[PDB]
Design a protein around this ligand. Structure first.
Ligand SMILES: Nc1nc2c(ncn2[C@H]2C[C@H](O)[C@@H](COP(=O)(O)OP(=O)(O)OP(=O)(O)O)O2)c(=O)[nH]1
Ligand SMILES: [Mn+2]
Ligand SMILES: [Mn+2]
Length: 218
Protein backbone atom coordinates (compact mmCIF):
# COMPACT_ATOMS: atom_id res chain seq x y z
CA UNK A 1 0.00 0.00 0.00
CA UNK A 2 1.11 3.55 -0.76
CA UNK A 3 0.47 4.54 2.87
CA UNK A 4 3.34 2.24 3.88
CA UNK A 5 5.86 4.50 2.09
CA UNK A 6 6.91 6.44 5.20
CA UNK A 7 7.43 3.19 7.10
CA UNK A 8 9.42 1.80 4.17
CA UNK A 9 11.56 4.94 4.04
CA UNK A 10 12.26 4.61 7.76
CA UNK A 11 13.19 0.94 7.32
CA UNK A 12 15.44 1.43 4.28
CA UNK A 13 17.26 4.54 5.53
CA UNK A 14 17.67 3.13 9.01
CA UNK A 15 20.86 4.50 10.56
CA UNK A 16 21.56 5.82 14.06
CA UNK A 17 18.26 5.34 15.84
CA UNK A 18 18.35 8.13 18.44
CA UNK A 19 19.97 11.03 16.52
CA UNK A 20 19.59 12.46 13.01
CA UNK A 21 20.45 15.74 11.33
CA UNK A 22 18.85 18.44 9.20
CA UNK A 23 20.35 20.62 6.51
CA UNK A 24 20.67 24.32 7.26
CA UNK A 25 22.17 27.29 5.46
CA UNK A 26 25.79 26.53 6.31
CA UNK A 27 25.90 22.83 7.16
CA UNK A 28 23.98 20.07 8.92
CA UNK A 29 22.62 20.33 12.46
CA UNK A 30 22.24 17.29 14.75
CA UNK A 31 18.77 16.66 16.19
CA UNK A 32 19.24 14.62 19.36
CA UNK A 33 16.13 12.45 19.31
CA UNK A 34 14.87 9.52 17.21
CA UNK A 35 13.64 10.24 13.71
CA UNK A 36 9.87 9.84 13.50
CA UNK A 37 7.23 9.72 10.78
CA UNK A 38 6.44 13.45 10.98
CA UNK A 39 10.11 14.19 10.28
CA UNK A 40 9.90 12.08 7.14
CA UNK A 41 6.72 13.92 6.12
CA UNK A 42 8.59 17.22 6.59
CA UNK A 43 11.36 15.88 4.34
CA UNK A 44 8.90 14.80 1.63
CA UNK A 45 7.08 18.14 1.79
CA UNK A 46 10.22 20.27 1.51
CA UNK A 47 9.99 21.81 4.99
CA UNK A 48 13.12 20.09 6.37
CA UNK A 49 15.93 18.12 4.74
CA UNK A 50 17.13 15.00 6.52
CA UNK A 51 20.69 13.79 6.82
CA UNK A 52 20.91 10.30 8.31
CA UNK A 53 23.90 9.08 10.32
CA UNK A 54 24.71 5.77 8.62
CA UNK A 55 26.43 3.98 11.48
CA UNK A 56 24.39 2.22 14.14
CA UNK A 57 25.83 1.97 17.64
CA UNK A 58 27.35 -1.48 16.97
CA UNK A 59 29.29 -0.12 13.95
CA UNK A 60 26.96 -1.70 11.37
CA UNK A 61 25.04 -0.10 8.50
CA UNK A 62 21.74 -1.07 6.90
CA UNK A 63 22.56 1.00 3.80
CA UNK A 64 25.58 2.42 1.98
CA UNK A 65 26.13 4.73 -0.97
CA UNK A 66 28.54 5.81 -3.63
CA UNK A 67 28.55 9.61 -3.81
CA UNK A 68 29.40 10.73 -7.36
CA UNK A 69 30.28 14.44 -7.51
CA UNK A 70 31.18 16.90 -10.23
CA UNK A 71 34.18 18.74 -8.81
CA UNK A 72 33.24 22.25 -7.74
CA UNK A 73 35.70 24.03 -10.07
CA UNK A 74 34.17 22.23 -13.07
CA UNK A 75 30.66 23.63 -12.42
CA UNK A 76 31.46 27.24 -13.38
CA UNK A 77 32.89 26.31 -16.80
CA UNK A 78 31.30 27.04 -20.17
CA UNK A 79 31.10 23.32 -21.03
CA UNK A 80 29.59 22.33 -17.66
CA UNK A 81 27.13 19.98 -19.37
CA UNK A 82 29.98 17.68 -20.45
CA UNK A 83 30.74 17.06 -16.79
CA UNK A 84 27.08 16.41 -16.02
CA UNK A 85 27.14 13.72 -18.70
CA UNK A 86 30.44 12.42 -17.27
CA UNK A 87 28.82 11.99 -13.84
CA UNK A 88 26.24 9.71 -15.48
CA UNK A 89 28.97 7.78 -17.29
CA UNK A 90 30.76 7.14 -13.98
CA UNK A 91 27.52 6.08 -12.30
CA UNK A 92 26.83 3.64 -15.16
CA UNK A 93 30.34 2.20 -14.97
CA UNK A 94 30.01 1.55 -11.23
CA UNK A 95 26.52 0.14 -11.74
CA UNK A 96 27.88 -2.41 -14.22
CA UNK A 97 30.45 -3.58 -11.65
CA UNK A 98 27.82 -3.83 -8.91
CA UNK A 99 25.59 -5.83 -11.26
CA UNK A 100 28.44 -8.29 -11.92
CA UNK A 101 28.58 -8.91 -8.16
CA UNK A 102 24.77 -9.31 -7.85
CA UNK A 103 24.52 -6.17 -5.70
CA UNK A 104 21.10 -4.60 -6.18
CA UNK A 105 21.32 -0.80 -6.17
CA UNK A 106 19.40 2.37 -7.01
CA UNK A 107 20.33 5.73 -8.54
CA UNK A 108 19.38 9.10 -7.02
CA UNK A 109 19.87 12.56 -8.53
CA UNK A 110 21.18 14.50 -5.53
CA UNK A 111 19.66 17.89 -6.39
CA UNK A 112 22.89 19.73 -7.20
CA UNK A 113 26.05 18.20 -8.69
CA UNK A 114 25.80 14.44 -9.01
CA UNK A 115 24.28 11.12 -8.05
CA UNK A 116 24.14 8.67 -5.20
CA UNK A 117 24.14 4.93 -5.83
CA UNK A 118 22.28 3.43 -2.88
CA UNK A 119 22.79 -0.13 -1.62
CA UNK A 120 20.38 -1.57 0.98
CA UNK A 121 20.73 -4.61 3.25
CA UNK A 122 18.07 -6.82 4.81
CA UNK A 123 19.89 -6.68 8.15
CA UNK A 124 22.82 -4.42 9.07
CA UNK A 125 26.32 -5.44 7.94
CA UNK A 126 29.71 -4.53 9.38
CA UNK A 127 30.54 -1.04 8.12
CA UNK A 128 34.13 -1.96 7.35
CA UNK A 129 33.04 -4.95 5.26
CA UNK A 130 30.78 -2.99 2.92
CA UNK A 131 33.29 -0.13 2.70
CA UNK A 132 36.02 -2.57 1.67
CA UNK A 133 33.78 -4.21 -0.95
CA UNK A 134 32.88 -0.80 -2.37
CA UNK A 135 36.52 0.30 -2.45
CA UNK A 136 37.60 -2.84 -4.29
CA UNK A 137 34.77 -2.41 -6.81
CA UNK A 138 35.63 1.26 -7.33
CA UNK A 139 39.27 0.24 -7.90
CA UNK A 140 38.07 -1.67 -10.99
CA UNK A 141 37.15 1.48 -12.92
CA UNK A 142 38.62 4.73 -14.13
CA UNK A 143 36.80 8.05 -13.88
CA UNK A 144 35.91 10.56 -16.58
CA UNK A 145 37.22 14.13 -16.32
CA UNK A 146 35.71 16.32 -13.62
CA UNK A 147 34.24 13.52 -11.48
CA UNK A 148 35.02 12.25 -7.97
CA UNK A 149 33.57 9.21 -6.21
CA UNK A 150 33.25 8.88 -2.44
CA UNK A 151 32.06 5.91 -0.39
CA UNK A 152 29.66 6.24 2.53
CA UNK A 153 30.34 5.12 5.20
CA UNK A 154 33.85 6.55 5.41
CA UNK A 155 34.09 6.39 9.19
CA UNK A 156 33.46 2.75 10.11
CA UNK A 157 33.97 2.96 13.91
CA UNK A 158 31.87 5.41 15.92
CA UNK A 159 34.20 5.65 18.95
CA UNK A 160 31.37 7.27 20.90
CA UNK A 161 30.45 9.82 18.22
CA UNK A 162 27.93 10.13 15.40
CA UNK A 163 30.04 9.42 12.28
CA UNK A 164 29.18 10.45 8.74
CA UNK A 165 25.74 11.58 7.62
CA UNK A 166 24.18 11.49 4.15
CA UNK A 167 21.26 13.45 2.73
CA UNK A 168 18.50 10.96 1.91
CA UNK A 169 16.29 11.07 -1.22
CA UNK A 170 12.87 12.66 -1.75
CA UNK A 171 13.66 15.98 -0.07
CA UNK A 172 14.95 19.34 -1.26
CA UNK A 173 18.64 20.25 -1.50
CA UNK A 174 18.90 23.57 0.35
CA UNK A 175 21.83 24.69 -1.83
CA UNK A 176 19.64 24.77 -4.96
CA UNK A 177 15.99 24.29 -4.05
CA UNK A 178 15.92 21.21 -6.29
CA UNK A 179 14.26 17.91 -5.43
CA UNK A 180 16.43 14.85 -4.85
CA UNK A 181 14.82 12.07 -6.87
CA UNK A 182 15.27 8.45 -7.86
CA UNK A 183 16.22 7.97 -11.52
CA UNK A 184 16.24 4.93 -13.78
CA UNK A 185 19.42 3.43 -15.19
CA UNK A 186 19.18 5.84 -18.15
CA UNK A 187 18.99 8.76 -15.66
CA UNK A 188 15.36 9.62 -16.37
CA UNK A 189 13.44 10.81 -13.32
CA UNK A 190 11.07 8.12 -12.03
CA UNK A 191 7.49 9.34 -12.38
CA UNK A 192 6.02 7.62 -9.29
CA UNK A 193 8.67 8.04 -6.61
CA UNK A 194 6.51 6.56 -3.83
CA UNK A 195 5.78 3.37 -5.77
CA UNK A 196 9.48 3.15 -6.62
CA UNK A 197 10.45 3.50 -2.96
CA UNK A 198 7.91 0.83 -1.96
CA UNK A 199 9.47 -1.74 -4.31
CA UNK A 200 13.19 -1.20 -3.63
CA UNK A 201 14.88 -4.57 -3.00
CA UNK A 202 17.39 -5.24 -0.21
CA UNK A 203 20.55 -7.30 -0.53
CA UNK A 204 21.10 -10.32 1.71
CA UNK A 205 23.61 -9.64 4.49
CA UNK A 206 24.78 -13.26 4.26
CA UNK A 207 25.71 -12.77 0.58
CA UNK A 208 27.47 -9.46 1.33
CA UNK A 209 29.46 -11.12 4.12
CA UNK A 210 30.45 -13.89 1.72
CA UNK A 211 31.52 -11.36 -0.90
CA UNK A 212 33.67 -9.51 1.65
CA UNK A 213 35.42 -12.76 2.57
CA UNK A 214 36.05 -13.75 -1.05
CA UNK A 215 37.46 -10.34 -1.98
CA UNK A 216 39.50 -10.19 1.24
CA UNK A 217 40.96 -13.65 0.54
CA UNK A 218 42.09 -12.82 -3.02
N1 LIG B 1 28.11 17.67 9.05
C1 LIG B 1 28.09 18.04 7.66
N2 LIG B 1 27.82 17.00 6.68
C2 LIG B 1 27.78 17.41 5.28
C3 LIG B 1 27.99 18.67 4.86
N3 LIG B 1 27.89 18.69 3.54
C4 LIG B 1 27.61 17.42 3.12
N4 LIG B 1 27.55 16.65 4.23
C5 LIG B 1 27.23 15.26 4.01
C6 LIG B 1 25.68 15.12 3.51
C7 LIG B 1 25.80 14.92 2.18
O1 LIG B 1 24.69 14.16 1.61
C8 LIG B 1 27.10 14.09 2.02
C9 LIG B 1 27.74 14.23 0.78
O2 LIG B 1 28.15 15.60 0.55
P1 LIG B 1 28.00 16.25 -0.96
O3 LIG B 1 28.61 17.62 -0.92
O4 LIG B 1 28.51 15.32 -1.91
O5 LIG B 1 26.40 16.49 -1.06
P2 LIG B 1 25.15 15.53 -1.71
O6 LIG B 1 25.80 14.28 -2.31
O7 LIG B 1 24.06 15.39 -0.63
O8 LIG B 1 24.54 16.57 -2.90
P3 LIG B 1 25.52 17.28 -4.04
O9 LIG B 1 26.88 16.50 -4.11
O10 LIG B 1 25.62 18.68 -3.58
O11 LIG B 1 24.69 17.12 -5.31
O12 LIG B 1 27.99 14.67 3.14
C10 LIG B 1 28.28 19.76 5.90
O13 LIG B 1 28.47 20.90 5.58
N5 LIG B 1 28.31 19.40 7.25
MN1 LIG C 1 30.58 14.41 -1.95
MN1 LIG D 1 27.42 14.44 -3.72
Amino acid sequence: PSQNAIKRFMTLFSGREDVFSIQYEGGYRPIRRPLNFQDIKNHFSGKKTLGIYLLKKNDTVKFAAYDIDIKKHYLNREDKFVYEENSKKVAKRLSRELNLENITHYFEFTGNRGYHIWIFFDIPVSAYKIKYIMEKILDRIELEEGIDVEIFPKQTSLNGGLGNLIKVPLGVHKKTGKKCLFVDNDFNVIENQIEFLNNIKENKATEINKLFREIFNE
